């Protein structure tokens, strides 16, 4: 990922990975759905 975005803030990259490789996003979409 660093070799893909070599100028990006190394700390901003790591941040995005630990979200996809956790899929906390879809888990949130699923929990929010239970009250709709």
């Amino acid at each position: 990922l660093q070799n893909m975005f070599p100028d990006m803030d190394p700390s901003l990259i790591e941040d995005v990975c630990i979200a996809a490789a956790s899929r906390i996003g879809p888990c949130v979409d699923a929990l929010l759905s239970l009250s709709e």
């Binding site: 979200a19 949130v28 929990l31 929010l32 009250s35």
Partner: protein
């Protein structure tokens, strides 16, 4: 008053806000310190997704409450 926002890595940042500030206003500040555009920010508090046009008071967000930032992936 101070409020806290839990970032992507679980780290907490502080924001100085007024109860009447909007979620939009809060997202703007988060962009300043986290490098995430507002449109890619999703904020969660007390089991609810916060909407841009509502205020902190609207969600019963008080001094030292913690909001959760989730990357819009």
């Amino acid at each position: 008053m101070q409020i806290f926002v839990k970032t992507l890595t679980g780290k907490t940042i502080t924001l100085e806000v007024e109860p009447s500030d909007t979620i939009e206003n809060v997202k703007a500040k988060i962009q300043d310190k986290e490098g995430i555009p507002p449109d890619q920010q999703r904020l969660i508090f007390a089991g609810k997704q916060l909407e841009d046009g509502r205020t902190l008071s609207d969600y019963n967000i008080q001094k030292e409450s913690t909001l959760h930032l989730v990357l819009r992936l």
